[PDB]
Symmetry: C10
Subunit: 74 residues, 10 copies
């Protein structure tokens, strides 16, 4: 049991690595939003919902990693 | 039995690392969408479905990783 | 045989890491498609099949990874 | 008990790797803010709250990593 | 002989990591092809063979990884 | 107690990896500052405080890594 | 002798990771070739040998990795 | 005590990995400096001190890594 | 001796990882050369020696890694 | 004594991974040099020393890694 528990904990730590993708990804979406609005302010109401969708989908991948982490911890 | 179970849990954590590619890839697609629409609002109905296809195919690679993760966990 | 089995499962996990390349690559191809069409809408029918070929070739590298993963899991 | 404790401390260290994602992502958001404002100073009041939101969401991913780290440590 | 076999299977999995380089590289080549053709449609016949060559040479690096993988697996 | 101490020192080293995110992110912010000022010198006073804020927030992610490192070291 | 053999096979797998560098690098060279020729078709005969040289030198780095792999295997 | 010593040396090695960030970051700052000056030579005296500050802050992250490395090697 | 030899071999494999930097770096230099010459063919004789220096310096870092590999192997 | 020596050699190999940052960073500097000179040949005497400074400081980070590698080896 102690070896299995040990592995659960190492596994949980490893499972957070993939969240780096969402950290970068969310930023890339928001960077495009800012650059898009700066170049064409009139487009703001069109691209803002696209940014919200983009960030939500990128974030979802990190949440998949976190779910695995929590399953290993709990 | 103990060591094998330990390995499954370590393996499950490692199998989520690949999800970072989808986290970044989804963002790259949505960034291109936002930048393309800002530069040419008239093209939005054409490029929006391309973004959905792009996102889905990128996400599919992360779902393959998750698949292996859940096979190892369960 | 516990050691060998343990190694198969760890190895199977490690074998999925390379799929991040297809995750990023497929996105890069589709981003170029979107930016290309935005800049020159008339080129769509020319570049769309290029993007399909591009995606499929990038994805194949990831499917090689997954193939090794399944060989370790099941073979 | 030594084995589980060992795993907690190694897991806690591994759990910080994902913070590199927020390190880079936060920067990408602020780079976009600076480049967007330099190109179009009049847009500053519009894009600045977008940058705050982008930073916060990217930062959150790194906070989920740190959460797992602190769970493993404490 | 169990330790050696274990090592072969660990080694085989590690040997697939480098395939990420071809996944990204093949995409980079196709991205340039699409962007080049969009900017200058008349150049299509000239640059398409360049893309095929670039793709093949990038893919070859992944195939060297896969070769080592299968040497280790079998 | 030797295994646990070993784990702390391994964990402490692993905990510095995430600092690469701040090394790159701080540079990305300063790169945008330099490029923004080169393109529009009149904007210097506006964007410099944005760069300071972006740098601090990126650096904070590395400082969270270093915090875990020192918790493990001492 | 089992321990040394094990290390040779794990070392051989690790030795292929560096090939991702050539995978990406070769692609970067060919992307530049395609973009340069699309922008200026008349320059093709000048830049094509530059691309062959660039590819070869980037590829060489991956070959040094494969060399170590084959030394460890054989 | 062999195990603890072994761990110090492995840990010291691992602690240098983060220096790749300063390697890349310092370069990024200097590239921006070069491109900024090329595009607008008159801005040189304004942006050169920004690049020095930028490099030094990026490098500090790597020096934190190396600090942990030396603590493990010698402390 | 067998454990030390085992470690030499793992160490050698790990020491090739850093060559990925030269693989990418050499390519980035050659990409700039190609793009520079395409935009301004008249500059070719000026930037070609800069490219040779750039690639040589980037390559040197990979050669440092390879030297460590060889010291561990021989 | 055996395990400690084993660790020094594994540690020495790991300590070269960081050199990839210098491999990439040196290239990024020289790419900017080439692109800046191509766009504005008249600035070459000004930006060339900036490139040398940039390269040296980037290379210094890789030399720090190598330093640790040689301390572990010798």
């Amino acid at each position: 049991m102690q070896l299995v528990l040990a592995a659960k904990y190492i596994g949980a730590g490893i499972s957070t690595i993939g969240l780096l993708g969402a950290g970068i990804g969310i930023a890339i979406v928001f960077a495009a939003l800012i650059n898009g609005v700066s170049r064409n302010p009139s487009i703001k109401d069109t691209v803002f919902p696209m940014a919200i969708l983009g960030f939500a989908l990128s974030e979802a991948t990190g949440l998949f990693c976190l779910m695995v982490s929590f399953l290993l911890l709990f």
